Ligand binder design. Structure first.
Ligand code: BEF
Ligand SMILES: [Mg+2]
Lengths: 128, 10
């Protein structure tokens, strides 16, 4: 993946977004923007240029699953990688993530090493 | 859980 790939980090908790942003920076990914929920995320995605989405599961107004489906059902955004992050892994949510087209699914908290591993799995799958 | 995640490629 290009070091300048533009990420959108979506989470309703500002501190979690900051942490993810810092982990990305530690990996060399400096081009990162934030969104506080699915609606806000879609609004910023309309600006174009994004190449990777990392989204939390539980958020008001539009949660992560809802955001993921919206992205996958949109002609211009349908191919964007989306890594789901969740406070708790439940079989039902994992199966839901797969059905909706999640590129990845990771339980927080996670280290930079784990983030790198999950990103690389996605890059490899998609030929990025 | 982990076997599911692993089987799905997550
Ligand atoms: F609110 Be997230 F799913 F941790
Ligand atoms: Mg949340």
């Amino acid at each position: 993946a290009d070091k300048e790939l533009k990420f959108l980090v979506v989470d309703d908790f500002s501190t979690m977004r900051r942490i993810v942003r810092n982990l990305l920076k530690e990996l060399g990914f400096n081009n990162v923007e934030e969104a506080e929920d699915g609606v806000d995320a879609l609004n910023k995605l309309q600006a174009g240029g994004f190449g990777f989405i990392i989204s939390d599961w539980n958020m008001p107004n539009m949660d992560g699953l809802e955001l993921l489906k919206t992205i996958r059902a949109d002609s211009a955004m349908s191919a964007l990688p989306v890594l789901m992050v969740t406070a708790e892994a439940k079989k039902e949510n994992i199966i839901a993530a797969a059905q909706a087209g999640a590129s990845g699914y990771v339980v927080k908290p996670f280290t930079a090493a784990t983030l790198e591993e999950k990103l690389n799995k996605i890059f490899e799958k998609l030929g990025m | 859980v982990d076997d599911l995640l692993d089987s799905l490629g997550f």
